[PDB]
Amino acid sequence: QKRREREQHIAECMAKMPQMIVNWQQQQRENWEKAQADKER
Amino acid sequence: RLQYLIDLGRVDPSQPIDLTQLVNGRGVTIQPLKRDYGVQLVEEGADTF
Amino acid sequence: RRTPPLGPMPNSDIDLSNLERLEKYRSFDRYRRRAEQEAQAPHWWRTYREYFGEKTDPKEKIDIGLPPPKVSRTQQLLERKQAIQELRANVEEERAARLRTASVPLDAVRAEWERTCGPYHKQRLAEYYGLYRDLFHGATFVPRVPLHVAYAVGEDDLMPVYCGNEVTPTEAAQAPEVTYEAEEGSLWTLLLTSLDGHLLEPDAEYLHWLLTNIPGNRVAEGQVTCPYLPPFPARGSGIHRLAFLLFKQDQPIDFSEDARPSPCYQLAQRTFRTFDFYKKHQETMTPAGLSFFQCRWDDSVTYIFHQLLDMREPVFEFVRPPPYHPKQKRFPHRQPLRYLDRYRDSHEPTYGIY
Amino acid sequence: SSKNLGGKSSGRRQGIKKMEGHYVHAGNIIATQRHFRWHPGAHVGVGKNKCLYALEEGIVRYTKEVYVPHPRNTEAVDLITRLPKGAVLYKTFVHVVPAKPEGTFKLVAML
Amino acid sequence: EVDPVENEAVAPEFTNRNPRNLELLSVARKERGWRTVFPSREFWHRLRVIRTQHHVEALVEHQNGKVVVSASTREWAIKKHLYSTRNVVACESIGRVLAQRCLEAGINFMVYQPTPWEAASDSMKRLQSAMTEGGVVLREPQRIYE
Amino acid sequence: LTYFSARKGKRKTVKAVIDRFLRLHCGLWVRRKAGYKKKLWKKTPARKKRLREFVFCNKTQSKLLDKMTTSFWKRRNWYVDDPYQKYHDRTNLKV
Amino acid sequence: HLATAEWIAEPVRQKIAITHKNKINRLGELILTSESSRYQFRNLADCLQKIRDMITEASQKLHRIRIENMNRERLRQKRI
Amino acid sequence: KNILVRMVSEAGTGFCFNTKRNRLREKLTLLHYDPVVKQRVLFVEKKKIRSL
RNA sequence: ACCUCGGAGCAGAACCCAACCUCCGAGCAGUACAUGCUAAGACUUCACCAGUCAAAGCGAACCUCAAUUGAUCCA
Ligand SMILES: [Mg+2]
Ligand SMILES: [Mg+2]
Ligand SMILES: [Mg+2]
Ligand SMILES: [Mg+2]
């Protein structure tokens, strides 16, 4: 039961994972956009 | 070792073999005070047994 | 303690007085060019070329070829330049060159490349592949006859053997069609030999075709002194060299000591040495064409070993030398259990007297 | 008094570990150096403390070769492009001449 | 006893004398090192381009320094069809001819080492594009160490 | 150490040695590297692996540990799934 | 002898032949070797496991060769 | 001025690693290789250990 | 007054080499987040401890710096 619960939790997180990949990446490029705006200032 | 004991006659194959028979044939030494729990049969010489 | 230099120093002829007034490398490309010529210079100190470069004898490798064709340089360059100004007077050529949309006819470029400068390049390729070291023991020739050879595959397909492309023995199983521009009354000899591929002798090669006394461009009426055996490189033995040699023959030559019998499927009889054969017949022909190719093992190769040659197919594999592993210490002071596993022989448990 | 402090560091034990003609196995460190005194040549790799080790197994040879730096090495290219014409730099390089072939083809079956 | 076939005498070690043998098996040594200097000499074959004031020239050359194949605007074969011998059209024509010549000779891989301005130059981009569509790969495969 | 005990008249074992070292029956002493669990944010990955290794000892250190341990720790032990059953013995060792 | 092995079905037998012709001798028999242990028991067990794996798969560098074959096609392109 | 921070994986594997970051910066989120799932996954910060 | 670490001279050219000898510094900072795993062969501050480089391989991609540091127990 413990092993199956751990594997199910890992599978759930990895299922949800690529959306957090892409939205963290767009957040990072938005940080780049804010940084280049601020150094344009 | 088992085949050697059988060929030299210290272990009788015509009767069931256990720890008393092996110890009486002096094929193994067992020290239960030194946490020995018996004899493990290992695979050396399986090709000629 | 000092020792004077054994020759001129490298940066010695540069005047160190007017070093602001001297001309300068402002270009990495200019420095790279000058450093490359200085690296190609001989030098009297120890050099990577001395320790790693290949050391040929200064024999000035003898030409065993045909004399070069003679051209008239003056009218040659006149025709060159007038073709050039005609093309430059073509207005659309300049427009295409400026718009970077021009092109070049590859087939015509190739064909008259073998017309003018293909022979010297072909000699350079075959020198790189090392036939003149192997086939001819150093002696060189410029192949002055374009020797087009192709293999009929399928019903509309054929395989050109150009100067070292890979041709599988499926494509090389039957006889290749050969052409080479020629005149009437001039005799020829065509030879196919496998250099790498001798299973027993490290020095000898195998004859595969010894067609002799060819009247001209027609190839099918000459004396077949040995039938065509398709190449047979063994499994895992690597990539082998097969060479077509074309010889200009002036007189007719008997080939009786070198006539392989009716179908000759013995490698001992098919043993061959281009050095010895051209040594025996040197005063008779002169090499004029050369085309070679590369081959690997195939199922057709398995077929020729089993059915034709009546052989159990040899199998070779490429094995690496055993690793170093220094002499084992009784106390491997700062090493791991991996050191003990390095010197272990068998991976299974052992029990000794028990 | 004696207001000078420090300077008590021991010697680094650097320098040549393998001279000319020494038989050297793969991965053996040839030289250890604080600056680029000897440069890597053929079959000699360089480690991030600028150490020199053998990439192949063989014989160590020290030669003297022309020096053409990488066009991204800015300070070296600056020295090159300020050098006078007709001059070339020379550096001492370390090579390993490999003694053994990579392997052999040998018969394993008679299929 | 069975009489052995006199053909079946095979040497227990094969001696392949092809200089391209271990190279095409990808077990031959590439000359590693020279990490401080330029260019890198860890290759088997190298494309080297020389753009002179009048001519564009290209070699395919072994590690030994032996020239395998060459192609130049110096040759009549190229001069008959270029408007000028120093254009990017010139370079593309040289690359197309050299690509078919390497196809022609059996050199399928080679290592091209341009300096940054050469690599950024349109002529060399057109050159490598012509080489790639001609059929040669400008990246050599890795050596099999084990 | 204690060469003759007060109760038995026997040599005693240094437990600090027992809790730090492992003696293979061939005669080798295995140990861990000092500070292999200290300041790993400072230590580089190659240095971390070097510290995670299990390393042997000198002849001098081995003789010293053999003197601090009694003969009970030098016996041959036939454990069930000992991961050092391979390393208890020497193979192909010439002098 | 692979061809006269009645305990193997016909199409999987042909699949075994065309898949492992590099282990078929000229007498038409399959050859399997094991040298992974110093016990002939384990070596024979490995050989039998190889036979079983071959039967079940029959029931069920490459880059270099591919690119050179593409170049051989591009040289092959010339018709009559 | 800097701080050592422990970052825990978002894959739920419990894997974690310590990095340094400036104290004045916000809460860190990185893409680091998780060896349990054999894949480069997100790690968010979860603790601050000591001051650097 | 100093006590630990590093660079230069003394110690000119493999290594090493002292003084309450002559000078200069260090007890970090910056980047990265595969700064992952594993593994031939070596170096070594004159011992040990500690320290250093690294082929190949798996998996990816297509670190600078000179010192910039602290063992065991225990928490
Ligand atoms: Mg000092
Ligand atoms: Mg000192
Ligand atoms: Mg030491
Ligand atoms: Mg590696």
Side-chain angles (χ1 to χ4, degrees), chain B residues 43-47, chain G residues 38-42:
Chain B
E43 63 253 11
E44 297 287 315
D47 291 331
Chain G
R38 72 176 181 264
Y39 304 122
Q40 302 288 359
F41 272 65
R42 287 178 183 168

Side-chain angles (χ1 to χ4, degrees), chain C residues 327-341 343-345 347 350-351 354, chain F residues 28 31 33 49 53-59 61-62 78 86-87 90-95:
Chain C
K327 181 167 139 274
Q328 193 182 175
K329 312 175 180 265
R330 195 188 292 271
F331 288 101
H333 169 43
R334 288 168 66 85
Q335 304 279 328
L337 316 162
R338 326 202 302 254
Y339 176 102
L340 263 63
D341 284 312
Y343 297 102
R344 196 166 318 282
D345 212 318
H347 69 285
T350 179
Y351 301 95
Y354 310 102
Chain F
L28 298 185
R31 66 177 178 87
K33 299 266 298 178
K49 197 211 198 303
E53 301 315 279
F54 287 77
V55 298
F56 291 111
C57 293
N58 296 115
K59 166 172 176 184
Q61 304 169 331
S62 301
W78 290 105
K86 302 190 297 181
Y87 313 123
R90 304 303 291 277
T91 61
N92 293 345
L93 176 70
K94 294 320 159 184
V95 188

Side-chain angles (χ1 to χ4, degrees), chain C residues 159-195:
Chain C
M159 201 56 28
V161 62
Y162 278 143
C163 67
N165 44 3
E166 182 170 278
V167 177
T168 52
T170 45
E171 293 154 343
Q174 274 66 11
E177 314 172 355
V178 190
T179 187
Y180 49 98
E181 59 92 20
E183 83 271 14
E184 195 68 30
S186 57
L187 197 65
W188 309 95
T189 286
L190 188 135
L191 175 61
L192 174 58
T193 49
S194 77
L195 270 165

Side-chain angles (χ1 to χ4, degrees), chain A residues 17-29, chain H residues 42:
Chain A
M17 192 55 148
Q19 192 62 38
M20 285 158 308
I21 301 298
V22 65
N23 68 11
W24 170 77
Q25 262 173 8
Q26 71 89 32
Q27 205 270 329
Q28 291 299 114
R29 74 171 179 262
Chain H
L42 274 297

Side-chain angles (χ1 to χ4, degrees), chain D residues 46-66:
Chain D
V46 56
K48 74 186 72 162
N49 54 356
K50 294 182 287 293
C51 84
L52 299 192
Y53 58 99
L55 285 168
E56 302 310 314
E57 160 152 17
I59 301 299
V60 181
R61 304 302 208 172
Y62 295 68
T63 61
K64 287 196 169 31
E65 307 277 320
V66 310

